[PDB]
């Protein structure tokens, strides 16, 4: 019953993803390939990271995550494959996902394979890891990889070997922690009783605005549900509401809701109306919150 | 070989749909998840309804339809799960899908689970139902559901239990008919001998124009194939053509075809050219037809 | 084990693709349906051809390719089903896909089913074929096909019977070569020294520019990796770079790379930046290359 | 030295204004024609009114204002010509315009000629009038006016006769006050200590936002320069600044300025940056202000 | 008293028009410069023609028309200066412009100066001409003309000398009729009964649709006011209305009016709403009319 | 016959420019007001400068240039009024505008009045000046100037007094050279033997591309007419052509012309087609030229 959950920047407009899938079914006949998404901004490693960081607790143990934007395709770089440690706790977000009390996942139960370009930065931060290897063995990659298609050659193909039971430690040599490329995550700042961050994403298709200011940052400031907040975007577009659990708490349709999203980050929206689209709000815009 | 057919407003730009799928495979390991679409206009319950109403006759018996736009997420509302009666929008004669004379489907062979917000209005009207229940059991939903993700908590999760053979009647208490929310469907009005309705959809990616004017409305004003029609749109733009079964009946490429769509509604198109896009025709525009 | 790889112009915005998939699972319960793509420009048979021509070597033997844009839907036309000969564009060696030396695929191991409208022109040219039949038998198509949905009736449905092991030669009468509709492929011309073609596609989502000037055309001029080229787009844009294997060979981010894409065609891009989007370059613009 | 100041909806893209001007120079050889503007939204009488209400104090005594949007062109309607009473005081706005203490204008010194469609509503409100006449005499309009060009026939042409010294009372019969069409001006409301109005205009080319909340309404509420204000636009986009005389009082470039515009209305802008354009703010959006 | 009416493709976004005007005042101190328009599509001589053909009857006798789009700037080409014959399109009666019965204009009373590129084609056709000269004398053009600014050097400058009374016949040698470049005017054709032309212009800023089907073409078919017409735009839009004198005859706001515009051509619009803009109708689309 | 040539950022969509003109005619009854343009990007002092720097040689002696973008409106700043020295950007030989050998203009024949914000930087550099004064006298500005309209109060009004013969030296105290604000003009840098500059403007309405690379920069790297050039734009888009005096030298319509504009700067265009618009070329993009 193996699963590969596949996240790329290949888009869905041509046969690129299908070539990868065909090879996945070829290598691992029993596999199920689940699309995460293929629409990320090409080469935006930070955005790709957002789409994969929270996946493990949702998937059956033993799932392989094939995650790739590969701007260094065709160079001497090689992918990294890592077995993560914890599926939740740090990335708990509530706790375990599923019905009842949720589904507890054993430690060391998920593998990610990716370009070694920092794509896995937040996965490693949130989940930790037990082992990491450079992906070099001709048992799991082509002897003559297509220079402009490493998302296929160096990620899709070896992910299928791993799903098929190829031993992780046999993909190539162990990588020391310092050899795993990471991106810098900008910290939430204090100024002086207010918290200053950024719009991390526009939540399509709804036009909700998500910031990088986390529940932990709020509860550190004595901010919880019911707190009257001022949330200023782009430095000049401000908004005022109490922090509420959900959209409908804003009352009438179109009213402003300030809430915590399902990943636990301070967010702003209109109730059953789009906030970002009419005002052309964008990721990267500053976001400041105060009580 | 259980199937879940999954229709949401979650989009395909982030990991939202994948989180749902991971849980489906977690709960029902042998499941096949089939995407209906995830692109509907958020919170447009009437549009969501059109994408799900005619699904049962195409699917194997025992398929579960997980269908959701959930603007009331995080409120005290709970989903409804219903077993439908007739698979066909027909009866005796049926109009079954498939090769030869098509595949007849037994009655009571399909379950829908959806927010109780009217999404199922036309499914219930066209198909009838045998039983309906409120979805409240912690055996099939989380004890601590994520307030902003009821499409996952209250639809995806329980649909996978249902696919896995969890008894429908055990998801919660029976709902009386009046407790199942319905939307009103605006009637085609009669203006002299013209039928007056609306553009119900622009049929992407083709730019065909679908109206809410049914064959039955037409064959009550004296109109069948071959009839010379005048179809007026948005109160301004006029077209004239005989009613024909298909696009190529219009003759040359670009010529106007007035026809009945595969759902049996009065529609207008250009033959192998887009009608809607160059004239910026839109859903909700008035549509008037006369012989 | 059977697989149907499905390429259509139906889009991903309504239930059209799902209706086809439901019927595929109905007819061939153990099938895996793999999406190629559903976003092609409607009725653009040359574009559809590009998404399907290179598929066979990526898929397990016995895979059925259901490939369809059907502007002649509802007419007396019938689909064609063909068994291809060679899975490669090559053979001597092969450039087989996969890890190690790749997966060699037996001859006669793939079936395409498509409208007989030229969609398979390049499939037939690159792979050859062993047999071809008109798709007419009520064992594999509806007795009463929906006039406006032949992509479902005349492609999806019979593809599932073929996947389930329905004998290919029983779908209908053999077709003679001349009865298989072909489109003309404009040839890459010569004057010089130089080579005059077109932009065949903008490679979404990256904005790379693909030409119809093939590596075999380049070989014909003794043009290889390292050669300083002038590539003029649209008649007035003399791009200059050496031919290199990949994007990063251009050096700095945003620099011009002239390269051979994974399909083997002369292409041009910027290194980890979009070439086509900022300057609105488009398919159909002229492309001239010289050393 | 006569002047006609000319405001129309004819645009500047064809010869329409030039035909009018040629006739003006023909009728009144010594005249100077000054363009006010020709770009108003066609048929928007309220917008046209904004462009003409404040003109008299800027112009030499004896100036004729030819002001026209004529959606009733070619009907039995006839223009109105009015001599206004006061050039300023009510429409003082500071007081008199010009160097030193400004240029005092005698009463009864300006004539407007316009369609009788309410275009002059605010001119009459702010300035009063001494006499008003229907424009019917063949001495000042064509005997056979072009049905679709009353802006020329019934405004431009007679305005030139008036500039040339044709007696105002000879254009046709006197009009009683009730025969002069007026539009309704929505009042600024109180709720309960806040003032609720509308964005009256986006001030192009700067993207400043002008409201219909006047200095008089503010000083009625005890609001003056230095007051810390909250100005909420579109019901949800709020802004906070002190009321200042000018843009640069906001400090850094791009900072929000809340100010009184040169017509004396509460306005909001960014300092040397556009406010309206990045956020797509529009006329008609609600505007609420409170101290 | 002299007047120069100035039509160019120079735009209103830089100092180009002002440079020409400065030179006009330098050469003819007492001149009045009247702008026709400066916004024509550059190099579109047929469009430029439309803005200048009807000017003479609106202006005092002796007016000089400086009219220019000059794509051949900087070549050996020289402008043409012509004295026109008839100020009208008529004569018998005349439909003179102005109050009363209008201002009759003497023959031979207007001069056009233009590039010899066909810009004056319709001026010559409708008005006739008495004399024409090549503009070559260094008394009226620069000895060293700016290569890229012949609209200034070869039109604006000599127009001012002509306005100042420089003898027309002294500008250079007489031109024979065949040396005056003309463009072809596509004829209004017949098949029926019906009349087949084109949309000649979208009438900005209103979005009315003007055709090249003239009142004299309509008279030829016995088509007059009151006739129930079908006007098909773009081949597929059979508009139906009676021919009426003006917009308001259509009744309700937004209703279709088919009318004769002030230039005498069959036109179509909505009553106080834009026809062309919502449906993106364009110049060059086919136009067919029948009764 | 005094002239004021008027350049502002006020636009032509409301009554702002007309208010200024009315006051000009009020103060100087015999004045002619000539519009330069009113469309400049608000607050872009460098762009404003380009529209005014070469005006004097085209205008009669004694013309006053009223030139204004006033982002510091309502502050303690006051305008500067200067009498320039040389009318030509030349000296001996001069390069005079007009018919024959052009019209020589006496030294000290023109006055500019402008905000003291650097708008006059290039006027002063190219022309020199004889005297400069701060504009403060209540004889020429309002005692109570409208805070948000200094373009009217501190430019329009005093320019009309100056046109009327008010002694320049009486507007206020003399300004020392260091008190006249200047902007810095970025130099063309030298990279090997390539000249590196920028796109200074897109030349609307034509879509020609003007660079800041002067003939003098070129004829110092060894480039005159006939020289084969490579011009690279935005660091990506390449063009190649000989330097020619005009557009038609390129041959066929659409062919690339590299030329010197009427201001003597290196420019690039298509022959009677727009270059900038299809490729979305923009001001501020890098421009590099080499022989
Ligand atoms: N801004 C929103 N207002 C109301 N509902 C919303 C909003 N954004 C997302 N949703 C709904 O949340 C459900 C999550 F399961 C989705 O299906 C959206 O309908
Ligand atoms: N407007 C159309 N003209 C011709 N063919 C069309 C049109 N719209 C959709 N189609 C074709 O219908 C087939 C249904 F199976 C699709 O594959 C479209 O190509
Ligand atoms: N233009 C490009 N520059 C650098 N990388 C690119 C470019 N276009 C595509 N790619 C990467 O190639 C990988 C294919 F495997 C994709 O994942 C792109 O990230
Ligand atoms: N790119 C151009 N090609 C041909 N002619 C042009 C171009 N740009 C501007 N012009 C013409 O130059 C004349 C200057 F007087 C203008 O009238 C333009 O028509
Ligand atoms: N389509 C139109 N409907 C009603 N009025 C119109 C329309 N187009 C132009 N106009 C008016 O005609 C007058 C010409 F004098 C202009 O002022 C327009 O307001
Ligand atoms: N928002 C603005 N910030 C700074 N200056 C502005 C703004 N809007 C208009 N202006 C300037 O006001 C002057 C009025 F005379 C105009 O010329 C603008 O430059």
PDB file of N, CA, C and O in Angstrom, chain D residues 2-31:
ATOM      1  N   UNK D   2     -14.156  88.500 -24.872  1.00  0.00           N
ATOM      2  CA  UNK D   2     -15.031  87.483 -24.265  1.00  0.00           C
ATOM      3  C   UNK D   2     -14.387  86.105 -24.138  1.00  0.00           C
ATOM      4  O   UNK D   2     -13.536  85.736 -24.949  1.00  0.00           O
ATOM      5  N   UNK D   3     -14.775  85.367 -23.100  1.00  0.00           N
ATOM      6  CA  UNK D   3     -14.304  83.989 -22.893  1.00  0.00           C
ATOM      7  C   UNK D   3     -15.497  83.039 -22.778  1.00  0.00           C
ATOM      8  O   UNK D   3     -16.510  83.367 -22.161  1.00  0.00           O
ATOM      9  N   UNK D   4     -15.365  81.877 -23.398  1.00  0.00           N
ATOM     10  CA  UNK D   4     -16.278  80.758 -23.141  1.00  0.00           C
ATOM     11  C   UNK D   4     -15.416  79.660 -22.544  1.00  0.00           C
ATOM     12  O   UNK D   4     -14.402  79.253 -23.134  1.00  0.00           O
ATOM     13  N   UNK D   5     -15.803  79.208 -21.360  1.00  0.00           N
ATOM     14  CA  UNK D   5     -15.147  78.056 -20.752  1.00  0.00           C
ATOM     15  C   UNK D   5     -16.048  76.861 -20.983  1.00  0.00           C
ATOM     16  O   UNK D   5     -17.244  76.877 -20.649  1.00  0.00           O
ATOM     17  N   UNK D   6     -15.465  75.825 -21.576  1.00  0.00           N
ATOM     18  CA  UNK D   6     -16.241  74.750 -22.243  1.00  0.00           C
ATOM     19  C   UNK D   6     -15.966  73.401 -21.550  1.00  0.00           C
ATOM     20  O   UNK D   6     -14.813  72.943 -21.451  1.00  0.00           O
ATOM     21  N   UNK D   7     -17.030  72.787 -21.016  1.00  0.00           N
ATOM     22  CA  UNK D   7     -16.916  71.503 -20.324  1.00  0.00           C
ATOM     23  C   UNK D   7     -17.914  70.558 -20.972  1.00  0.00           C
ATOM     24  O   UNK D   7     -19.113  70.855 -21.011  1.00  0.00           O
ATOM     25  N   UNK D   8     -17.444  69.424 -21.492  1.00  0.00           N
ATOM     26  CA  UNK D   8     -18.373  68.481 -22.117  1.00  0.00           C
ATOM     27  C   UNK D   8     -18.008  67.038 -21.822  1.00  0.00           C
ATOM     28  O   UNK D   8     -16.992  66.760 -21.187  1.00  0.00           O
ATOM     29  N   UNK D   9     -18.846  66.120 -22.308  1.00  0.00           N
ATOM     30  CA  UNK D   9     -18.505  64.699 -22.307  1.00  0.00           C
ATOM     31  C   UNK D   9     -18.095  64.189 -23.696  1.00  0.00           C
ATOM     32  O   UNK D   9     -18.188  62.983 -23.975  1.00  0.00           O
ATOM     33  N   UNK D  10     -17.634  65.087 -24.565  1.00  0.00           N
ATOM     34  CA  UNK D  10     -17.334  64.713 -25.959  1.00  0.00           C
ATOM     35  C   UNK D  10     -15.989  64.010 -26.161  1.00  0.00           C
ATOM     36  O   UNK D  10     -15.725  63.456 -27.248  1.00  0.00           O
ATOM     37  N   UNK D  11     -15.146  64.030 -25.132  1.00  0.00           N
ATOM     38  CA  UNK D  11     -13.793  63.465 -25.212  1.00  0.00           C
ATOM     39  C   UNK D  11     -12.882  64.295 -26.107  1.00  0.00           C
ATOM     40  O   UNK D  11     -13.312  65.274 -26.717  1.00  0.00           O
ATOM     41  N   UNK D  12     -11.633  63.871 -26.212  1.00  0.00           N
ATOM     42  CA  UNK D  12     -10.634  64.564 -27.028  1.00  0.00           C
ATOM     43  C   UNK D  12     -10.042  63.630 -28.094  1.00  0.00           C
ATOM     44  O   UNK D  12      -8.900  63.811 -28.531  1.00  0.00           O
ATOM     45  N   UNK D  13     -10.807  62.631 -28.514  1.00  0.00           N
ATOM     46  CA  UNK D  13     -10.269  61.618 -29.407  1.00  0.00           C
ATOM     47  C   UNK D  13     -10.708  61.797 -30.867  1.00  0.00           C
ATOM     48  O   UNK D  13     -10.137  61.184 -31.769  1.00  0.00           O
ATOM     49  N   UNK D  14     -11.702  62.653 -31.101  1.00  0.00           N
ATOM     50  CA  UNK D  14     -12.114  62.988 -32.453  1.00  0.00           C
ATOM     51  C   UNK D  14     -12.359  64.494 -32.643  1.00  0.00           C
ATOM     52  O   UNK D  14     -11.990  65.299 -31.800  1.00  0.00           O
ATOM     53  N   UNK D  15     -12.989  64.859 -33.740  1.00  0.00           N
ATOM     54  CA  UNK D  15     -13.194  66.266 -34.060  1.00  0.00           C
ATOM     55  C   UNK D  15     -14.429  66.926 -33.427  1.00  0.00           C
ATOM     56  O   UNK D  15     -14.734  68.077 -33.753  1.00  0.00           O
ATOM     57  N   UNK D  16     -15.117  66.234 -32.518  1.00  0.00           N
ATOM     58  CA  UNK D  16     -16.337  66.782 -31.932  1.00  0.00           C
ATOM     59  C   UNK D  16     -16.162  68.145 -31.235  1.00  0.00           C
ATOM     60  O   UNK D  16     -16.903  69.088 -31.508  1.00  0.00           O
ATOM     61  N   UNK D  17     -15.176  68.256 -30.352  1.00  0.00           N
ATOM     62  CA  UNK D  17     -14.933  69.530 -29.667  1.00  0.00           C
ATOM     63  C   UNK D  17     -14.513  70.592 -30.660  1.00  0.00           C
ATOM     64  O   UNK D  17     -14.941  71.734 -30.565  1.00  0.00           O
ATOM     65  N   UNK D  18     -13.682  70.206 -31.637  1.00  0.00           N
ATOM     66  CA  UNK D  18     -13.212  71.161 -32.647  1.00  0.00           C
ATOM     67  C   UNK D  18     -14.357  71.739 -33.499  1.00  0.00           C
ATOM     68  O   UNK D  18     -14.307  72.910 -33.875  1.00  0.00           O
ATOM     69  N   UNK D  19     -15.363  70.927 -33.835  1.00  0.00           N
ATOM     70  CA  UNK D  19     -16.525  71.441 -34.567  1.00  0.00           C
ATOM     71  C   UNK D  19     -17.214  72.530 -33.759  1.00  0.00           C
ATOM     72  O   UNK D  19     -17.619  73.563 -34.323  1.00  0.00           O
ATOM     73  N   UNK D  20     -17.366  72.286 -32.461  1.00  0.00           N
ATOM     74  CA  UNK D  20     -17.978  73.241 -31.550  1.00  0.00           C
ATOM     75  C   UNK D  20     -17.145  74.511 -31.495  1.00  0.00           C
ATOM     76  O   UNK D  20     -17.687  75.605 -31.562  1.00  0.00           O
ATOM     77  N   UNK D  21     -15.831  74.364 -31.336  1.00  0.00           N
ATOM     78  CA  UNK D  21     -14.941  75.538 -31.271  1.00  0.00           C
ATOM     79  C   UNK D  21     -14.978  76.350 -32.572  1.00  0.00           C
ATOM     80  O   UNK D  21     -15.068  77.573 -32.557  1.00  0.00           O
ATOM     81  N   UNK D  22     -14.907  75.673 -33.714  1.00  0.00           N
ATOM     82  CA  UNK D  22     -14.984  76.396 -34.976  1.00  0.00           C
ATOM     83  C   UNK D  22     -16.234  77.277 -35.042  1.00  0.00           C
ATOM     84  O   UNK D  22     -16.162  78.417 -35.493  1.00  0.00           O
ATOM     85  N   UNK D  23     -17.378  76.749 -34.619  1.00  0.00           N
ATOM     86  CA  UNK D  23     -18.617  77.541 -34.620  1.00  0.00           C
ATOM     87  C   UNK D  23     -18.556  78.690 -33.617  1.00  0.00           C
ATOM     88  O   UNK D  23     -19.078  79.784 -33.891  1.00  0.00           O
ATOM     89  N   UNK D  24     -17.900  78.456 -32.483  1.00  0.00           N
ATOM     90  CA  UNK D  24     -17.722  79.511 -31.473  1.00  0.00           C
ATOM     91  C   UNK D  24     -16.912  80.689 -32.010  1.00  0.00           C
ATOM     92  O   UNK D  24     -17.339  81.837 -31.859  1.00  0.00           O
ATOM     93  N   UNK D  25     -15.776  80.405 -32.659  1.00  0.00           N
ATOM     94  CA  UNK D  25     -14.999  81.458 -33.320  1.00  0.00           C
ATOM     95  C   UNK D  25     -15.737  82.093 -34.484  1.00  0.00           C
ATOM     96  O   UNK D  25     -15.563  83.293 -34.709  1.00  0.00           O
ATOM     97  N   UNK D  26     -16.548  81.312 -35.203  1.00  0.00           N
ATOM     98  CA  UNK D  26     -17.377  81.860 -36.293  1.00  0.00           C
ATOM     99  C   UNK D  26     -18.372  82.904 -35.795  1.00  0.00           C
ATOM    100  O   UNK D  26     -18.489  83.984 -36.384  1.00  0.00           O
ATOM    101  N   UNK D  27     -19.089  82.565 -34.723  1.00  0.00           N
ATOM    102  CA  UNK D  27     -20.141  83.420 -34.173  1.00  0.00           C
ATOM    103  C   UNK D  27     -19.586  84.640 -33.428  1.00  0.00           C
ATOM    104  O   UNK D  27     -20.145  85.739 -33.516  1.00  0.00           O
ATOM    105  N   UNK D  28     -18.512  84.428 -32.675  1.00  0.00           N
ATOM    106  CA  UNK D  28     -17.917  85.456 -31.807  1.00  0.00           C
ATOM    107  C   UNK D  28     -16.436  85.586 -32.161  1.00  0.00           C
ATOM    108  O   UNK D  28     -15.587  84.985 -31.510  1.00  0.00           O
ATOM    109  N   UNK D  29     -16.122  86.351 -33.213  1.00  0.00           N
ATOM    110  CA  UNK D  29     -14.758  86.391 -33.751  1.00  0.00           C
ATOM    111  C   UNK D  29     -13.652  86.690 -32.730  1.00  0.00           C
ATOM    112  O   UNK D  29     -12.559  86.168 -32.852  1.00  0.00           O
ATOM    113  N   UNK D  30     -13.951  87.516 -31.729  1.00  0.00           N
ATOM    114  CA  UNK D  30     -12.973  87.923 -30.700  1.00  0.00           C
ATOM    115  C   UNK D  30     -12.803  86.955 -29.525  1.00  0.00           C
ATOM    116  O   UNK D  30     -12.021  87.235 -28.600  1.00  0.00           O
ATOM    117  N   UNK D  31     -13.549  85.855 -29.529  1.00  0.00           N
ATOM    118  CA  UNK D  31     -13.678  85.015 -28.332  1.00  0.00           C
ATOM    119  C   UNK D  31     -12.385  84.233 -28.036  1.00  0.00           C
ATOM    120  O   UNK D  31     -11.574  83.965 -28.952  1.00  0.00           O
TER     121      UNK D  31
END
